[PDB]
Amino acid sequence: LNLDEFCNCSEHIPSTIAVVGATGSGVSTAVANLLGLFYIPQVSYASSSRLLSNKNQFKSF
């Protein structure tokens, strides 16, 4: 919605349904911002910071 104009992307670009990552908690937070912007689930394997338990910010983590 942020752009009034219309953007174009080639159909060859696929749609990611979920993401596996990442290792660092700061990296996971930065990724989680954009991913939860679009409600894309993200499942981490090494990030263990408690700050990523807050669901008022990280909707899909």
Partner 1 sequence: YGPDQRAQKKGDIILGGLFPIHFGVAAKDQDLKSRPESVECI
Partner 2 sequence: IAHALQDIYTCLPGRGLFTNGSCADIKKVEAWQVLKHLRHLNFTNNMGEQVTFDECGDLV
Binding residues for Ca(2+): 23, 48
Question: Which token pair is 14?
Answer: 């696929």
CA atoms within a 13 Å half-sphere pointing along the CA-CB vector of 10: 2
Tokens 């700061």: give the residue. Answer: 26
20 binding partner 2? (CB under 8 A): yes
- The contact set with ligand TCR (CB under 6 A) reads 23-25, 46-49
Instruction: Among 1, 8, 43, 47, indicate the residue that binds partner 2 (CB under 8 A).
Output: 43
Residues for the chain: how many in total? 61
Shortest distance in whole angstroms from residue 2 CB to partner 2: 19
